[PDB]
CSV table of C-alpha atoms and ligand atoms in Angstrom, one decimal:
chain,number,residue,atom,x,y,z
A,987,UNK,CA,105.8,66.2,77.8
A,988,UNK,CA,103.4,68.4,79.6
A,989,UNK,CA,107.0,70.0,80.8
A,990,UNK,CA,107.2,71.2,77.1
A,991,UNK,CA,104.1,73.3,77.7
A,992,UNK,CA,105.6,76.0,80.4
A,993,UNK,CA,109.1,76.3,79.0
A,994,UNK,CA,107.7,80.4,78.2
A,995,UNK,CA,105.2,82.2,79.5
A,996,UNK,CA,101.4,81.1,79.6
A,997,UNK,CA,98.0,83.1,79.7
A,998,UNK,CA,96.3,81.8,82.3
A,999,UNK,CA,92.4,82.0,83.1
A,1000,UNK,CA,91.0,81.4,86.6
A,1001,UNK,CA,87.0,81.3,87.4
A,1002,UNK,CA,85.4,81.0,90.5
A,1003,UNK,CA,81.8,80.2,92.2
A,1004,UNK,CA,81.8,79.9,95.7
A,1005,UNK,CA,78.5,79.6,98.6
A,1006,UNK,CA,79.7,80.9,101.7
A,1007,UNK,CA,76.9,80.2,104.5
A,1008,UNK,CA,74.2,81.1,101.6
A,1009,UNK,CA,76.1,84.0,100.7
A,1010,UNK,CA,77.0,83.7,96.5
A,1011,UNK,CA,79.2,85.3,94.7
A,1012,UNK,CA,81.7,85.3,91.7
A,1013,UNK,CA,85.4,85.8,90.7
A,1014,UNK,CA,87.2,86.0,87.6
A,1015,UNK,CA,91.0,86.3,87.1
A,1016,UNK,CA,93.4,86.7,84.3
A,1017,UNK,CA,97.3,87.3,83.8
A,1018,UNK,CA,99.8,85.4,83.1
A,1019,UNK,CA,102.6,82.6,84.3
A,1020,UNK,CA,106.5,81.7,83.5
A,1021,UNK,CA,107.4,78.5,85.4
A,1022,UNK,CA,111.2,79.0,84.2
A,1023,UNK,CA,111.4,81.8,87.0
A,1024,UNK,CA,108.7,80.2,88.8
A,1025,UNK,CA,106.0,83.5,88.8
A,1026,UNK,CA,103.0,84.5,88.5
A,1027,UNK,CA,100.7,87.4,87.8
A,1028,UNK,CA,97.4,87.5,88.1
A,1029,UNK,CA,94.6,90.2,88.8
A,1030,UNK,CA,91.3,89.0,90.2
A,1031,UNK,CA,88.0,90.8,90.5
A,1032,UNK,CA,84.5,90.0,91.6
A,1033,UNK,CA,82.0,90.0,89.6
A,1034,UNK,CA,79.3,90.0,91.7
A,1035,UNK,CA,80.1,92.9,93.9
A,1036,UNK,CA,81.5,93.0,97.1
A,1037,UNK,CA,83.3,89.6,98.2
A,1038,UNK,CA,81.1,88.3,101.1
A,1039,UNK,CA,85.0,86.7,102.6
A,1040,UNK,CA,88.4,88.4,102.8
A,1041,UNK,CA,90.5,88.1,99.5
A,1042,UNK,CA,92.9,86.2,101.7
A,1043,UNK,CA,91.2,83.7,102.5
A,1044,UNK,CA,90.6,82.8,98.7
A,1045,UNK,CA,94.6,83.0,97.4
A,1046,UNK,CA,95.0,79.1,97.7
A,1047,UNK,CA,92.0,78.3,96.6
A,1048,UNK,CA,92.3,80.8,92.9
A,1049,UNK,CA,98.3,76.6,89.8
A,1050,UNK,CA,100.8,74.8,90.8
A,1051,UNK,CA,101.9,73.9,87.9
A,1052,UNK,CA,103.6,77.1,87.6
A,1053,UNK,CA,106.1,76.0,90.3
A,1054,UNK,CA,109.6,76.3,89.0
A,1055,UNK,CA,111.1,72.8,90.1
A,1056,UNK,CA,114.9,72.9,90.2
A,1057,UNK,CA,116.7,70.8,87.4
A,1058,UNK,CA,117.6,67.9,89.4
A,1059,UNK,CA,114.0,67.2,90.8
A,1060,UNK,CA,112.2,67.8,87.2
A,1061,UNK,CA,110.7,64.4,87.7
A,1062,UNK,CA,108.8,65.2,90.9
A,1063,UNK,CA,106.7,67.2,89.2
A,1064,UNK,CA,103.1,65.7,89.2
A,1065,UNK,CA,101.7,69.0,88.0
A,1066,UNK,CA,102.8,69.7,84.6
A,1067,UNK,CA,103.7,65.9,83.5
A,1068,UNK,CA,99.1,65.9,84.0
A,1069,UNK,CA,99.5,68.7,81.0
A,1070,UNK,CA,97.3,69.1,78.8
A,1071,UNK,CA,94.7,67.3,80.1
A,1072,UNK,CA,94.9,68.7,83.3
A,1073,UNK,CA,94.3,67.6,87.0
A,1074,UNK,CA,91.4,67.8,89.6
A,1075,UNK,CA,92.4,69.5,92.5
A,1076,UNK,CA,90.6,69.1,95.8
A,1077,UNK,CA,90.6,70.7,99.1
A,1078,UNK,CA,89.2,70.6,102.5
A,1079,UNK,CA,90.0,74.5,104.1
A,1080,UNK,CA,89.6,74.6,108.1
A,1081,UNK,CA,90.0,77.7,109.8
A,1082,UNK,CA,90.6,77.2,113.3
A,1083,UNK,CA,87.7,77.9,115.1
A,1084,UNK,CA,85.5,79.3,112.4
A,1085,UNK,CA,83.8,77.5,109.3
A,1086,UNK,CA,85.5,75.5,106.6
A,1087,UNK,CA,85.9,75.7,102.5
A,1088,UNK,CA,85.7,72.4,100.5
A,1089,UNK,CA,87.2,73.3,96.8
A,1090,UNK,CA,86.8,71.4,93.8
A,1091,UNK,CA,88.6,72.0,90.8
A,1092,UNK,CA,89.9,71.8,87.3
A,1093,UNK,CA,93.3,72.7,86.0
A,1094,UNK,CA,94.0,72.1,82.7
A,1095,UNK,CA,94.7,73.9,79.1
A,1096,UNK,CA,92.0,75.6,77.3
A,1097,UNK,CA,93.6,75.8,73.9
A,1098,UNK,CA,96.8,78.3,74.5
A,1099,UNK,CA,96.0,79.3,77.9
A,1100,UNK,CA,96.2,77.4,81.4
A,1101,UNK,CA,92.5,77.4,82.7
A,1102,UNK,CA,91.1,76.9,86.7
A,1103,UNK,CA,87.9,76.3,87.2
A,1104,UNK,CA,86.9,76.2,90.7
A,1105,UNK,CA,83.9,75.2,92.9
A,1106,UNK,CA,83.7,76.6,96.4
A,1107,UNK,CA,81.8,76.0,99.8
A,1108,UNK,CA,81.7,77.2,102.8
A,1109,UNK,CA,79.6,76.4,105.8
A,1110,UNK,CA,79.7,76.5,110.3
A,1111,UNK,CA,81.1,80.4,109.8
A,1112,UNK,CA,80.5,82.2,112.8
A,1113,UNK,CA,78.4,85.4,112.1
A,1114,UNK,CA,81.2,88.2,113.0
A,1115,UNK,CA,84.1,85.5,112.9
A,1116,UNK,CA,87.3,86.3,111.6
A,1117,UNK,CA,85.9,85.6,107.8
A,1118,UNK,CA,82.6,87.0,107.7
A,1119,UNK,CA,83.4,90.0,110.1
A,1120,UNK,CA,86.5,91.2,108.0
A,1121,UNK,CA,88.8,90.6,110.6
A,1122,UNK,CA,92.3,89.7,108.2
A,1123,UNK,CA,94.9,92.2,107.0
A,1124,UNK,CA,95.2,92.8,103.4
A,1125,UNK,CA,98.6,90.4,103.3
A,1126,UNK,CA,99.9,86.8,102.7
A,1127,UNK,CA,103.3,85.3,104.1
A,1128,UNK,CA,105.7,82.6,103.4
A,1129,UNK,CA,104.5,78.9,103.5
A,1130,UNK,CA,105.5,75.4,102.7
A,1131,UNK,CA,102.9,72.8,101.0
A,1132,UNK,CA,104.6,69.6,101.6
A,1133,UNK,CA,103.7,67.2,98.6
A,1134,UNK,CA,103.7,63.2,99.3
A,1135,UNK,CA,102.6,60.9,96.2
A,1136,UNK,CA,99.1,59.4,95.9
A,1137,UNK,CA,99.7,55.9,94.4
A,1138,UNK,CA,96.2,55.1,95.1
A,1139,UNK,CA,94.5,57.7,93.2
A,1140,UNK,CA,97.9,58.0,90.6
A,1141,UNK,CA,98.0,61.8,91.8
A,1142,UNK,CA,98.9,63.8,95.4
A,1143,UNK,CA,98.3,64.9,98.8
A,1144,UNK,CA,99.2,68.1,100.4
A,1145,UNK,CA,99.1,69.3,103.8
A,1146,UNK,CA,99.5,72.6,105.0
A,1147,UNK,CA,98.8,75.4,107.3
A,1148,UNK,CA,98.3,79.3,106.3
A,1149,UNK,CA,98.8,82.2,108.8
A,1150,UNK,CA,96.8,85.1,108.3
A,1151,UNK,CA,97.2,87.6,110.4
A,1152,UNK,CA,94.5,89.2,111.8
A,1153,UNK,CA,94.1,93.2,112.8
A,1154,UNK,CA,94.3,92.7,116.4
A,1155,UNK,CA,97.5,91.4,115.9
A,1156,UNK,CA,96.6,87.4,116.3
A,1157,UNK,CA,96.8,85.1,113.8
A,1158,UNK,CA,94.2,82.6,112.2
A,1159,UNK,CA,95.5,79.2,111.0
A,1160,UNK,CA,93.9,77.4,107.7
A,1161,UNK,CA,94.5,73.9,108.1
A,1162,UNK,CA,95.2,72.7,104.3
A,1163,UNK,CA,94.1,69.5,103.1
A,1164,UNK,CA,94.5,68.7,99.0
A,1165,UNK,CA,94.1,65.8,96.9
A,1166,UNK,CA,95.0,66.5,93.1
A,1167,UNK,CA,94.2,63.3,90.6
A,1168,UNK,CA,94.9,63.1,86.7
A,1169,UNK,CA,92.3,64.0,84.6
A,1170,UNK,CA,93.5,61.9,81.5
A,1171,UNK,CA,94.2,58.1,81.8
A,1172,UNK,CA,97.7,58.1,81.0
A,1173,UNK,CA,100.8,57.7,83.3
A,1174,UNK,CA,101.9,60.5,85.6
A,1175,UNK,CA,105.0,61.2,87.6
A,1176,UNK,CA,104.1,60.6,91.2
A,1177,UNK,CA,107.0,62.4,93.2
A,1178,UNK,CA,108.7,61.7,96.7
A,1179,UNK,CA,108.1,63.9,99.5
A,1180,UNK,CA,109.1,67.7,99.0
A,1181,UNK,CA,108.1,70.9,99.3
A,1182,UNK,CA,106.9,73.6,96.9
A,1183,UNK,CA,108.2,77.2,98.9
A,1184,UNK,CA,105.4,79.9,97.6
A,1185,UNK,CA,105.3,83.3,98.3
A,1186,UNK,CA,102.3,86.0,97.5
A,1187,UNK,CA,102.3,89.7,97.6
A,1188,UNK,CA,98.4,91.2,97.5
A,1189,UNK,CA,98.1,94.6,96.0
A,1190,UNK,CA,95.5,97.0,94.7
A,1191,UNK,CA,95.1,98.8,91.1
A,1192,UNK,CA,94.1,102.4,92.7
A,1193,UNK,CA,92.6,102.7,89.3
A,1194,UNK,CA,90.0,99.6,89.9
A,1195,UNK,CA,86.5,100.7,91.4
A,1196,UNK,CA,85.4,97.2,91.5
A,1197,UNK,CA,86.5,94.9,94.4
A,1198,UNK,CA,89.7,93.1,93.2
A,1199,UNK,CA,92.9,91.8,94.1
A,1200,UNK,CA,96.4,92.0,92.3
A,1201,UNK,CA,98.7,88.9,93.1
A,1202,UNK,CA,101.9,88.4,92.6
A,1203,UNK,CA,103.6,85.0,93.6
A,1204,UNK,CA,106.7,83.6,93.7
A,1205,UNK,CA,107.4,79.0,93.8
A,1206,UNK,CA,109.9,77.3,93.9
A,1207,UNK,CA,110.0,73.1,94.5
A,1208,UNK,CA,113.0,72.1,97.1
A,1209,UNK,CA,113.0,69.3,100.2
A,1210,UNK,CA,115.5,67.5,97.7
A,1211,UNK,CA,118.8,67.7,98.3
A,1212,UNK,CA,120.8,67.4,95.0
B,1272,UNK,CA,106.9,119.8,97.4
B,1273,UNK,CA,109.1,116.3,98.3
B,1274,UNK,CA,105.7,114.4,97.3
B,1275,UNK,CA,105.4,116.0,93.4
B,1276,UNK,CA,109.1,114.0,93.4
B,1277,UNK,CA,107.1,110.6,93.2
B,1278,UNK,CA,104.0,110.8,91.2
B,1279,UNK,CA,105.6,108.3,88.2
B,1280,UNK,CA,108.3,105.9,88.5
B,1281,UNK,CA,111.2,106.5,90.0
B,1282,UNK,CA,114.9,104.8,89.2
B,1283,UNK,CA,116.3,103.4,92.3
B,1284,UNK,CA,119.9,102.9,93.0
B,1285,UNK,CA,121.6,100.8,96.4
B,1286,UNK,CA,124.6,100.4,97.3
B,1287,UNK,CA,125.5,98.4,100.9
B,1288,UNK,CA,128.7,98.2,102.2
B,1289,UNK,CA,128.4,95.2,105.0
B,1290,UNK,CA,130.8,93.4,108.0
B,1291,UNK,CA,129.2,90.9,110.1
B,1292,UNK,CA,131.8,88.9,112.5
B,1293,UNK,CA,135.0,90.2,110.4
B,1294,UNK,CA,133.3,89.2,106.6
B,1295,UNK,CA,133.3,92.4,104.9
B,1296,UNK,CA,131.0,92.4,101.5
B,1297,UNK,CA,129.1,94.7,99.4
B,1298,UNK,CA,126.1,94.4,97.1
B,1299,UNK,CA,124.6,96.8,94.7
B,1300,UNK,CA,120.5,96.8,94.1
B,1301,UNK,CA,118.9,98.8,91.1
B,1302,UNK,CA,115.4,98.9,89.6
B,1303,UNK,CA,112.5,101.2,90.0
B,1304,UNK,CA,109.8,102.0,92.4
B,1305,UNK,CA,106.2,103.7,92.4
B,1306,UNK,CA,104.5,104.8,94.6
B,1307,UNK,CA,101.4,105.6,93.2
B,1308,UNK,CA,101.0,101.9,93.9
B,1309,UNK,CA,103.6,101.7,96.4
B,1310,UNK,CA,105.6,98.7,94.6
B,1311,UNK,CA,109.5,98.5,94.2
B,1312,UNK,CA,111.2,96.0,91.6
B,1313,UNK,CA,115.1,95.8,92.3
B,1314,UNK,CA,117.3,92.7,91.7
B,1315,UNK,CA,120.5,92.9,94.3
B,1316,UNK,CA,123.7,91.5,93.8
B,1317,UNK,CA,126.5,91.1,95.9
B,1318,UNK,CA,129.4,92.4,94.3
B,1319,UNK,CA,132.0,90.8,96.5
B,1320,UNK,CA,130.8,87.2,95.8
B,1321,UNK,CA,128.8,85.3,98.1
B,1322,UNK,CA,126.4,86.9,101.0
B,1323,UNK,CA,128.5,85.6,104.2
B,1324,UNK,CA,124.9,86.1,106.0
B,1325,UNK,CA,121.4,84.7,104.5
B,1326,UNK,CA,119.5,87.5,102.1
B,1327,UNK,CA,116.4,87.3,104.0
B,1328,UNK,CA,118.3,89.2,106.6
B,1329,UNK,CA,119.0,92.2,104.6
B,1330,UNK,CA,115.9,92.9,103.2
B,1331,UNK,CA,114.7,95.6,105.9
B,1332,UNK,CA,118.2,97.4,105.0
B,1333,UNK,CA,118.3,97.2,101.7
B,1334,UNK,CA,113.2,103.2,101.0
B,1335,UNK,CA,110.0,103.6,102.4
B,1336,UNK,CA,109.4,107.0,100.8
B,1337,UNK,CA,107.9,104.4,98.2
B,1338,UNK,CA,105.2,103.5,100.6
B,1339,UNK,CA,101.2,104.9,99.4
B,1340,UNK,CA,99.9,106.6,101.8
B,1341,UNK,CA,96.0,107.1,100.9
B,1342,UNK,CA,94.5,110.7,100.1
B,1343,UNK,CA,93.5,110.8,103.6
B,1344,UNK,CA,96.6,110.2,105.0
B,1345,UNK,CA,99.0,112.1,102.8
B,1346,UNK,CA,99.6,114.8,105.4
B,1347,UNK,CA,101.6,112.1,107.5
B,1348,UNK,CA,104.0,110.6,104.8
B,1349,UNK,CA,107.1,112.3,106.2
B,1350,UNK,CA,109.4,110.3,104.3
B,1351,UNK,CA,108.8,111.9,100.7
B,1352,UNK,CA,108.5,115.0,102.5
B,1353,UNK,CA,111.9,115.3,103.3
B,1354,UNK,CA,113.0,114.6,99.0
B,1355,UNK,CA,115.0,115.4,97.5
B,1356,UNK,CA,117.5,116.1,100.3
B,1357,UNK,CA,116.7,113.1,101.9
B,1358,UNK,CA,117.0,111.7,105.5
B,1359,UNK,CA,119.4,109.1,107.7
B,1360,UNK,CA,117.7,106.5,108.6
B,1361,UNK,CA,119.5,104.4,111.4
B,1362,UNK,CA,118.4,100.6,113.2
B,1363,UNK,CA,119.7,98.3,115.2
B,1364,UNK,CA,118.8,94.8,114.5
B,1365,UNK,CA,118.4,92.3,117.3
B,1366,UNK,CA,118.3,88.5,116.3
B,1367,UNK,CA,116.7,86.9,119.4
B,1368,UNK,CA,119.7,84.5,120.5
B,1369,UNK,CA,122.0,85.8,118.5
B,1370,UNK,CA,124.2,88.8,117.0
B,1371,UNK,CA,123.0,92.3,115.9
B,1372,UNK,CA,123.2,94.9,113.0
B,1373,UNK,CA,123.5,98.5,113.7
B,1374,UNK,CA,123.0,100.3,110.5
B,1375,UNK,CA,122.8,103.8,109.2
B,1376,UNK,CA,121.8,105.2,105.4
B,1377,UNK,CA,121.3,107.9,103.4
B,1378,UNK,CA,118.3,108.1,101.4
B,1379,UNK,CA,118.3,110.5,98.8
B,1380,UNK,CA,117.7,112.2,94.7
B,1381,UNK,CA,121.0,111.8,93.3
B,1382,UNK,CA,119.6,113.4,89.4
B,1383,UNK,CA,116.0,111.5,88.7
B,1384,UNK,CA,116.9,108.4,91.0
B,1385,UNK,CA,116.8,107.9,94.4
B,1386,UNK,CA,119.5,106.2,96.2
B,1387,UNK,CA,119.8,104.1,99.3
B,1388,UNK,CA,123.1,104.3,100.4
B,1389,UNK,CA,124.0,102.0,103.9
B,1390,UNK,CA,126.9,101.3,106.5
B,1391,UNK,CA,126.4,98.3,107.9
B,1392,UNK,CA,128.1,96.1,110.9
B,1393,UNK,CA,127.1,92.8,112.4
B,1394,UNK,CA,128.6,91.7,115.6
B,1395,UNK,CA,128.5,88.5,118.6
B,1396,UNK,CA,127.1,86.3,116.3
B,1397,UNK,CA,127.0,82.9,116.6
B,1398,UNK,CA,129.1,80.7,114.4
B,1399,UNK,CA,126.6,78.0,113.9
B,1400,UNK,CA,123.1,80.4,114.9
B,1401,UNK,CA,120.5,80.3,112.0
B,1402,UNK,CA,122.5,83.5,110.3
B,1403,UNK,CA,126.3,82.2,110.3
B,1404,UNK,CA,124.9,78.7,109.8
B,1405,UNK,CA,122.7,80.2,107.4
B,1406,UNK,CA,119.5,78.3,108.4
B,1407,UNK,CA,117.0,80.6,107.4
B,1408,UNK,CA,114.3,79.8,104.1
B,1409,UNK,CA,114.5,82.4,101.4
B,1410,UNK,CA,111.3,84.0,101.9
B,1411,UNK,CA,110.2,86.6,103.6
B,1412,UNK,CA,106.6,87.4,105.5
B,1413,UNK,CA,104.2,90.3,106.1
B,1414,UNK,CA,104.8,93.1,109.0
B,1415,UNK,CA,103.3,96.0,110.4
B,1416,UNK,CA,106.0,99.0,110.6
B,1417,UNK,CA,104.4,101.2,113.4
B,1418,UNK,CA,105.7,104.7,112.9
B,1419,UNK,CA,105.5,107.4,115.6
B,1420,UNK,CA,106.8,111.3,115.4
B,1421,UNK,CA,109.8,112.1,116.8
B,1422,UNK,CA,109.6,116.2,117.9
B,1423,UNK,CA,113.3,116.5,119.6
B,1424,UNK,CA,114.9,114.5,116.5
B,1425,UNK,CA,112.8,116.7,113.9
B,1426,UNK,CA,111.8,112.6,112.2
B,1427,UNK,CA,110.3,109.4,113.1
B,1428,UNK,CA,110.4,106.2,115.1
B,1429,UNK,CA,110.1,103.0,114.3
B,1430,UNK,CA,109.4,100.0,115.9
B,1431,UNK,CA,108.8,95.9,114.6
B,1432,UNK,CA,109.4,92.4,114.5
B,1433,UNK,CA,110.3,90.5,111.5
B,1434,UNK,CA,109.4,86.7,111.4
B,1435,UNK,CA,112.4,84.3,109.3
B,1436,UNK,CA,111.1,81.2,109.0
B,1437,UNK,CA,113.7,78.8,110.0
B,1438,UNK,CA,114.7,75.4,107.5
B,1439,UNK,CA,113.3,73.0,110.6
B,1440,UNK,CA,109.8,74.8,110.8
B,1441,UNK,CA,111.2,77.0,113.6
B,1442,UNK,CA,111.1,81.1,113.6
B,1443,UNK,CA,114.0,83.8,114.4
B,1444,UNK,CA,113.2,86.9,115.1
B,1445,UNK,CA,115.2,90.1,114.7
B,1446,UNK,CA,113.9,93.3,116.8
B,1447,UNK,CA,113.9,96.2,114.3
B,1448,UNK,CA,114.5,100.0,116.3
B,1449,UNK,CA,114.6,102.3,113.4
B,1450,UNK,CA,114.9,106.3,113.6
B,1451,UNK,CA,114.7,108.6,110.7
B,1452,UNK,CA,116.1,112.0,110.4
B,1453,UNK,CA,116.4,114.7,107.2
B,1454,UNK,CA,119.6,115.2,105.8
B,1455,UNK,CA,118.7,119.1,104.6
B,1456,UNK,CA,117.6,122.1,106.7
B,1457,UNK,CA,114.0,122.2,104.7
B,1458,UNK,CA,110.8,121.8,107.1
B,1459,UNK,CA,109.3,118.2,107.4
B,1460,UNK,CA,105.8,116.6,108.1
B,1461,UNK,CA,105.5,114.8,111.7
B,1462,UNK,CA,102.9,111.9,111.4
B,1463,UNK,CA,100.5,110.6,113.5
B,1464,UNK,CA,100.5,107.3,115.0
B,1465,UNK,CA,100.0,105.0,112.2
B,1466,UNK,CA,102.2,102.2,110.4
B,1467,UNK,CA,103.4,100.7,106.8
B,1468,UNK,CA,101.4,97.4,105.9
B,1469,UNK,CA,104.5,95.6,103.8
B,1470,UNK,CA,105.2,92.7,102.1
B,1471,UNK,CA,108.5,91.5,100.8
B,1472,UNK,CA,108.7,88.8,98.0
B,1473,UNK,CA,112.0,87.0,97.0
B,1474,UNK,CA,113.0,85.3,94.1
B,1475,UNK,CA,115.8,84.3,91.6
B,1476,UNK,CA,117.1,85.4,88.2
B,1477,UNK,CA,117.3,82.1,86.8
B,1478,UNK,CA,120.1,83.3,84.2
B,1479,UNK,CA,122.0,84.9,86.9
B,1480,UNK,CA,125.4,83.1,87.9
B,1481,UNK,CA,126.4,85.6,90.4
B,1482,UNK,CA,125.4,85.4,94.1
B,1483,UNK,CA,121.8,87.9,94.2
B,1484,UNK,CA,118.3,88.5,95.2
B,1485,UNK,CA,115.4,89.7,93.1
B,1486,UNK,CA,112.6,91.5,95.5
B,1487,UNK,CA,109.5,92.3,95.3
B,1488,UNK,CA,107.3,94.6,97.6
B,1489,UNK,CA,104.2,96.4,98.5
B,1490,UNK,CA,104.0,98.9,101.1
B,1491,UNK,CA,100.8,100.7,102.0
B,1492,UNK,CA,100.1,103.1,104.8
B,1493,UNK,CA,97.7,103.0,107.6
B,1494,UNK,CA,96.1,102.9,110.9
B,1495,UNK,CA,94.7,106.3,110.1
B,1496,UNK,CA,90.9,105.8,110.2
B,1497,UNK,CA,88.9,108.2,107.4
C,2859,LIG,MG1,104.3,84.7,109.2
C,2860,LIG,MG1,131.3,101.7,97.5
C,2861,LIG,MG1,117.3,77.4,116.3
């Protein structure tokens, strides 16, 4: 079982090259995950200076995996049962009024340590938009990704909106739309509808002179009453 | 100087004493906090058995001398200012709809650790509102504490909104009016008008049997342009 594979706690390795409206750039992250509590910690840095988007805007984009799914709903758990070998993860990002990010990406074990490799694009930004204008606070809150099975492609859907609050006090949506699929050929456990509740607290190493961001986050599955 | 108290980490100590509609309980919270970074760890338990209300709607009671205020801000942190002695720090919590919670602590050095101790009592709430019927998610989101001097009082004001996210995709609110004043004689520092970025992350102790809340926060001053 790929369930055997989080019963402690994993190193986990996250690297990132994203395009937004021309503008390159890098990010690397490292730390750590325990899907018994459901937790992660992870501190992420650009390596290619300043990040041309708000570090917000990047959180679901940078394992699900690490979702602490009660005992009773063990079997919904696409994520880990596509362990070792991993899973493509896919998403289509739309911020409301403002450009979009289409993600590609690889999740799967790199000899001891849990390993994302992600693609990222960006494109119809507005010039001094929310994004590019560095409009969003320095936070995250509360959401739900609702997870339906994927028969078709032997993997899931997820659909989802984010709320980042902006500094004038508004908020700006991010319409969510994932597709994971197995990387292996094998048989996975497509689940029924639920929920995975995530949490993420951003923070700063005052010691860090390069831009970064430290995250801490917090999943548990639910949506199945039991 | 009250700020020289919080240069390392700091054990922190709470103890709540709580009756909302009749249901008297009590928890006790301990772990650590430092501001340097402006993180707390604590892990909250309620000692009488089960939380008659939801733990979401405790966090803001549960020490915001923890904050960080930035170097160029450090002249406005009047909450470490007023260490070791301490300060009261009173609200009254308004869920929209629904009952309220008037609450007053002392916040203090009792030895090396600080301690949060509160009086708390919840009235006209509804038996079958999103607190009674406990409908609320256990998460919490990010909020802007917008602080403001106080002259007459000799301490602070505080005014907010906290967002719980509701089971059915709804939102209750709950109106936070807090007022802080010190508890010794010694001269405080009177801020400017600026706020306390937070964020509150809840989790669970999966080998803990008893009824409890593990949190998780980051608070970081500003609104104070330099
Ligand atoms: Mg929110
Ligand atoms: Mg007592
Ligand atoms: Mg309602």
């Amino acid at each position: 079982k790929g369930e055997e594979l989080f019963t402690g706690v994993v190193p986990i390795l996250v690297e990132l090259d994203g395009d937004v409206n021309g503008h390159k750039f890098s990010v690397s992250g490292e730390g750590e995950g325990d899907a018994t509590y459901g937790k992660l910690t992870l501190k992420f840095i650009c390596t290619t200076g300043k990040l041309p988007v708000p570090w917000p805007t990047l959180v679901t984009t940078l394992v699900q995996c690490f979702s602490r799914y009660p005992d009773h709903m063990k079997r919904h758990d696409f994520f880990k049962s596509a362990m070792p070998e991993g899973y493509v993860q896919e998403r289509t990002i739309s911020f409301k009024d403002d450009g979009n990010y289409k993600t590609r990406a690889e999740v799967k074990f790199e000899g001891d340590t849990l390993v994302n490799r992600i693609e990222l694009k960006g494109i119809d930004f507005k010039e001094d938009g929310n994004i590019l204008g560095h409009k969003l606070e320095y936070n995250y809150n509360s959401h739900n990704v609702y997870i339906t099975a994927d028969k078709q492609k032997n993997g899931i859907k997820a659909n989802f909106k984010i709320r980042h609050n902006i500094e004038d006090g508004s908020v700006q949506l991010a319409d969510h739309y994932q597709q994971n699929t197995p990387i292996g050929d094998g048989p996975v456990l497509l689940p029924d509808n639920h929920y995975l509740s995530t949490q993420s607290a951003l923070s700063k190493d005052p010691n860090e002179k390069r831009d970064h961001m430290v995250l801490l986050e917090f999943v548990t599955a639910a949506g199945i009453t039991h």
